[PDB]
Amino acid sequence: ADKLFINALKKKFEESPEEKKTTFYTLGGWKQSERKTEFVNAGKEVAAKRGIPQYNPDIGTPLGQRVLMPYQVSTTDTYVEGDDLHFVNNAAMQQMWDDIRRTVIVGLNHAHAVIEKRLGKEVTPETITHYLETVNHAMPGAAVVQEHMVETHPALVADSYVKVFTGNDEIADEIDPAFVIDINKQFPEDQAETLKAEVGDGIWQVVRIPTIVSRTCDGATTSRWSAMQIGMSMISAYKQAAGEAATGDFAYAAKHAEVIHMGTYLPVRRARGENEPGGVPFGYLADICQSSRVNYEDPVRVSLDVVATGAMLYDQIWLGSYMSGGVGFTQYATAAYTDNILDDFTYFGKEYVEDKYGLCEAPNNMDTVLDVATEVTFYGLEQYEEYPALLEDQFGGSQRAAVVAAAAGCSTAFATGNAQTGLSGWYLSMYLHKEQHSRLGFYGYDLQDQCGASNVFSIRGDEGLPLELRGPNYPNYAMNVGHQGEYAGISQAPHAARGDAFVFNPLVKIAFADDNLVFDFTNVRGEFAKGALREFEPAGERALITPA
Amino acid sequence: AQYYPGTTKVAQNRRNFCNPEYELEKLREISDEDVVKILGHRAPGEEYPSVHPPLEEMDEPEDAIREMVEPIDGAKAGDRVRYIQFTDSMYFAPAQPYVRSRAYLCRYRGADAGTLSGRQIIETRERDLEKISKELLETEFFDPARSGVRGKSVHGHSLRLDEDGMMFDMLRRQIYNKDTGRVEMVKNQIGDELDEPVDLGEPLDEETLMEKTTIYRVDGEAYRDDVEAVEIMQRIHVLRSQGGFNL
Amino acid sequence: AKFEDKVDLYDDRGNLVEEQVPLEALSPLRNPAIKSIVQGIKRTVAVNLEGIENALKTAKVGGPACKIMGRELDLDIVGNAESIAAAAKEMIQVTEDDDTNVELLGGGKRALVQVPSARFDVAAEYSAAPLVTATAFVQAIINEFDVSMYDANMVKAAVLGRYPQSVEYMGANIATMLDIPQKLEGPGYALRNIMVNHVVAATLKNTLQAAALSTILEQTAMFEMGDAVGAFERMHLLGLAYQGMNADNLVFDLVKANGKEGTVGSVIADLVERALEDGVIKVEKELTDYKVYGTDDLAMWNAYAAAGLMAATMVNQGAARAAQGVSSTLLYYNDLIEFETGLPSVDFGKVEGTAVGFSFFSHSIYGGGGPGIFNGNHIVTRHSKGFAIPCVAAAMALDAGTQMFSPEATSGLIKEVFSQVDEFREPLKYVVEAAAEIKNEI
Amino acid sequence: AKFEDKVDLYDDRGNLVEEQVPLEALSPLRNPAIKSIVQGIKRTVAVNLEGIENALKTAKVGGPACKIMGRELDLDIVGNAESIAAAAKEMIQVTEDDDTNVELLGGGKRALVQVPSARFDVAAEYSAAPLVTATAFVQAIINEFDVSMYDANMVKAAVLGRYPQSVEYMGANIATMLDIPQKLEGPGYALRNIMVNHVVAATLKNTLQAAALSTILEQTAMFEMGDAVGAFERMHLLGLAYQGMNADNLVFDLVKANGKEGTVGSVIADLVERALEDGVIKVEKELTDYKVYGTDDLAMWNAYAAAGLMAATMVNQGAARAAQGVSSTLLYYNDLIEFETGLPSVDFGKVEGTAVGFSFFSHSIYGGGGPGIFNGNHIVTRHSKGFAIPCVAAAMALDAGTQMFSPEATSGLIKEVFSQVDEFREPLKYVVEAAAEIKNEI
Ligand code: F43
Ligand SMILES: C[C@@H](OP(=O)(O)O)[C@H](NC(=O)CCCCCCS)C(=O)O
Ligand SMILES: C[C@@H](OP(=O)(O)O)[C@H](NC(=O)CCCCCCS)C(=O)O
Ligand SMILES: O=S(=O)(O)CCS
Ligand SMILES: [Cl-]
Ligand SMILES: [Cl-]
Ligand SMILES: [Mg+2]
Ligand SMILES: [Mg+2]
Ligand SMILES: [Mg+2]
Ligand SMILES: [Mg+2]
């Protein structure tokens, strides 16, 4: 019956969502808001304590001449003021990033070959389990060889550990299950078969370093820290000299030859090492999100969970802090994961496709792009025109451009089963939207949008790439809000419609299928809500080593 | 020139704003002093500040392009580059953001135009800006209920209207008087209070807004129904796509 | 020749130089003057002897506001500039009378250095220029004053800065048009990482010369990047010719016709008319009171549109004598011409997209700056494959003094040294002369 | 005639080839064979056509363990290699008569590509080689099979990998000896970022040829970096001659005298005796039963000492047929010779220091690896200015199979393609011949 966003609009405003007029200016300004009132009071306290003015509602212009709205976290019944979705104020969002940043995947295949071929020693499921006991003591920062070592406090580093996975069920069954990511438990049968076949007899470690270290340091720490403690545990468990020539082979394997970073390093203007947000390709972000293994009968839900994951990380933390800062970009991102708005538009498109072509059954060509992206764009824009409350909700043109094009591009990919025609549909949506309303986004929103159509199918050096391989360092995408997380969703979309177990890297997909993570990647939007309510318990806090 | 495809009133209005041979309808008279006051860059009677010497006093490089391109008067004088910025309601304001920038670069010399969803700006040499601003304020570029002059705190293009049919303004620069039916500008574009308000006329009635608007909407003329305009946009998408692949 | 096209070549006063030259006589791969310009920019270094002297006498070395108390050295470098420069030249040259040049300027306050070509024939890249120059001058200063082993490290800091603790020559008193290889946004980008202000400084604000230098650099980089290979080569060459080299006098004539009273829109109308007159475009279909244009040669339409884009910049920013609106011209020229014609804009939308971001990052809090600080290696302005940055150079050349970060502010040492080289200052002259010389070898 | 020194040049069997060659005839700035080797390394690319085909058929593109389900494309690339390679060459070449080379290897599974020199004459650096090659092969594959617009992006990913999202060509199926310019530790380092395993691969494990290739690359980099300018030029030239080119047969004869039963220490004793016999060192002072040696020519002492260092490596690592101990030889040759003589060791302690860190980072948990993964651009091994890495290449050439990260593991594509180039495989021969040819021009 109702569009999916109607309940949220009725919560925000006294008027029915269709009504065109309202009342302004008599709401009390900031005084209408519980959260702004909290902030006013805290600012006075802070300024007095430190002897320097801080938050003051009388500086600049007076917030709250209109309704300061609640937001529904999409797929939840949780309604919060938008400040509770700012990454600074939301521990769930900070932990989501920490859990990615502090992860690396490191093979044991080369390592086991060094042991067998260079050292002449045996590797068995028993020696692997012994090694895994050893590395789970050492990885958080504790000693195995030298006398008079000082160590990290176990409780400060409780979130760091090492697990393994392999496609060989019989071998997996022989390793203590405390250390194993069980692919057959975590994934539905057809997905498990695909993932096991991709891994084969390879054995891979998923290493998580301590959040407290990641926060003190940076993402490029992760693979170094991992390798040091892998190295020590190989010495201890396999009876090497503690520092012989073979020890260097384990180092080079763990740091270079068999490591999978979450993010690659960035060029000098935006200089950063590995495991920073800009290095994480869109296909990896889709695979980090675990919606695919729990919501696989609903491709829209899978795709929009990916969009939530990426809009928060890429717009709020990455573009809104690493690349800028200040108040930042909360609502540029919340547009993609609140009020069930993107959900309504994308369900529309999925239904359109299902009825016309069947999922994955449309021709992979421009005719399909023109059909589906145009239809879905016109639907979404019509909703802003029919529901003035919707338009006042997603008040910035950029937000609207992102949401409408995300639906258009995901729907096109649902039709073709191919992310590249989904991307073409995203750009067509932009062009149509711009002409319809004689506006699109902010001053710089459509840099990538105007380069977009020509670069979708280019094959040139710094232009051509399948969408799955693109990321925040693809040149056209390196600067602007309201695109990156949506592109992760479009990358996910054809794979979700196809029922594929992963989008770009099966190892990354399996690595986040782990109940010992702090953040729950199977329910990203639920976790955002939990953090907004101040109900999420992050790792990395220093309470144990500070005064009461 | 043909400017823009399409067979709706919206399409024809977009063409008319861009066409310098189309005489913009003048709807209201504003004094020179009142334009200066709305702009807020200098006081009436204050000399224009300069950013560099008059061109006649500098030794310009020997350059055929300089010789062929006549500077605007404010460039000859060395005036500051200053701005005027407008916000247009999605509820049928006559002009809209990309319409303005497209039209400005057809009509006006020496212009830096910028388009955003909630604001649209022109920057040019101060004396020339004053002359352009008069036309932007006096003509059908501007309705005093559905358009606003705003150099900051621009929110309102996408908001519901108030009970008088006025767009939201966080700073309330334009005030409708229920007793008179007229709108006055009570602050300059950056929000400082004026000595004496500026009359901006009556808001256009609904029928006239619909005749003049350049936005497509379901409750006016929908873009999807202007099939020739849609066709051209789709053509451009396809040709760009093919061109990037092979030429 | 790979391609059939011929162009007529004109000078910066709009006078015909040579008729019916093969397009490939203008190719970076073939034209000897383009080769001379590239090799010249690789090998040329500006040395600030006054800056070195002042750094030493004050111990202000190693970057902004840095100083090491107790390390001052009182050396009369500028007073002994002839001896120091001769000594440096002996170390920089490979053989006597080779193509090494060391020339004092400003009464010995500055030196132009051109490191011999033979050093680059056995080098991977271009860093030999600053590195060889720096060490020669360091050694020459030490030897001139018999600076002790204990103190000589200050001379090194005064010349090259905080390198190698910094990646860059942070605080150096030498400068090049190129920047270090580590700063490339991608392999092949080095000729793109040349500030617009540096190009305008080297060309002394002559609008056509600045546009030519910029186009030569940008389009040459497109060859190094592989973009101008195979299917796209002709598009790149036609863009160099028509946008940067005033081929067929098209840029010049569009400016002439629109300079007195015209606008971006009036230049568009004239360009569309000229493309129709020349048979580049034709009516494909009639809609209601609207003609849809087509072409059988998209590369030539692109080149015509690119000439118009340059002319529109020169008319719009020339009328203002203010560079900032180049970002707007680059956007709306393209946006307007698509709806005027039904054909794609310059670089198939990539100029328009570059202009959207360039507009943003020249009018917002987030980064960027004024037009003059951009370049083809900048993240904001790298996206168009040579068709946007030359307009920015033309705009900056036309600015009468509206910019804080002007060439006078960012590029004075480059201006004094690099403007001395004739082929850097007047590249349109030398490239045209070379194209006419080689026209029957192509 | 800058320097008076002459050397006798030998072949890799210890036979005299040319007597009395002026030292400067071996300089990278003068010797035409060193120029040819450097320009060849800049322009040569290996293409793995089988790898491209397999990446496409499986959709395994973009880096380790990556795959895009549903994107598979089954193209008969190897089976159509001659047509594809010919089509690529047409795009790569500038003219039909130039120095472009495109040669199929392995029945079409691989191609050797040498991009024409004319492209590098108008380039800043060397990335035109991979980028021109990659786009020519991408376009040739697309054109061979009429790959659609919708699918062609997969061909691009199979050839060049995840670039430009990654800075490197991550997952590419092309390779060069050089690495991207962004990875340089400093300006001027590009010829140093060539893995030892790649040199050993190209030279087919011929110990003296590996040492020669490495020395030529390292010492040529020293010119590019400015280290071999002015005061230090002769030291660098003498090190190239004696350490890498077996000047005066000194390396060879030390090996011959110590190969059957010798040790590092016996090589040292023979080198000190030889330096005394030749008048390079002399007793300066007598302590209690201990002679302190001096010299009037530190650069020549360093060159003799460096020849000894190379011979000590060959004796010690040759006897083990195991490369790991090269880090130890590089350390203790130098430590022992200073306490034997009272004179500084090779590179004034910088070989010893490099060797300390290299030993640590080849026997510890912290980084590094086996000898073959090092190079002059590696943070561990950059410190000596050309005097350490050639010994590592000799040692890896002598390894009989003790290494996990061998050249077979790291450098197979490089081996197949670059060993085809005579001047890369047997560089000593060509450099000696060119030195002889120019001896009267010095
Ligand atoms: C000063 C600028 C120019 C600039 O470089 N950035 C600004 C301001 C900046 C500030 C505003 C914070 C503050 O008020 O102090 C921050 C929060 C970035 C920061 N420094 O933390 C921001 N914008 Ni802006 N900015 C936004 C937006 C927008 C929309 C707002 C249109 C409307 O009708 O309200 C327009 C662009 C457009 O017209 O499309 C816009 C403009 C502008 N944006 C204009 C100020 C507009 C004004 O005078 O009112 N932003 C949005 O469209 C939504 C998201 C929103 C961002 C905050 C969030 O994501 O929660 C914010 C993101
Ligand atoms: C352009 C560039 O800035 P500079 O021109 O180098 O100062 C770049 N910033 C950005 O791209 C900012 C992106 C986030 C803020 C805008 C979001 S639309 C950076 O800081 O490296
Ligand atoms: C050598 C290098 O490692 P790689 O050889 O590149 O793996 C480098 N590590 C280090 O320098 C480790 C320094 C800290 C540990 C040793 C302290 S003595 C790094 O990770 O970038
Ligand atoms: O107004 S601008 O588009 O520059 C910035 C929007 S946050
Ligand atoms: Cl063509
Ligand atoms: Cl000497
Ligand atoms: Mg009611
Ligand atoms: Mg009401
Ligand atoms: Mg075993
Ligand atoms: Mg468990």
Ligand SMILES: [Mg+2]
């Ligand atoms: Mg147990």
Ligand SMILES: [Mg+2]
């Ligand atoms: Mg009047």
Ligand SMILES: [Mg+2]
């Ligand atoms: Mg009055």
Ligand SMILES: [Mg+2]
């Ligand atoms: Mg005309």
Ligand SMILES: [Mg+2]
């Ligand atoms: Mg001169």
Ligand SMILES: [Mg+2]
């Ligand atoms: Mg066959």
Ligand SMILES: [Mg+2]
């Ligand atoms: Mg031939």
Ligand SMILES: [Mg+2]
């Ligand atoms: Mg085809």
Ligand SMILES: [Mg+2]
């Ligand atoms: Mg002996």
Ligand code: NA
């Ligand atoms: Na309500």
Ligand code: NA
């Ligand atoms: Na209604």
Ligand code: NA
């Ligand atoms: Na305020």
Ligand code: NA
């Ligand atoms: Na930067």
Ligand code: NA
């Ligand atoms: Na505490």
Ligand code: NA
């Ligand atoms: Na000379």
Ligand code: NA
């Ligand atoms: Na001829």
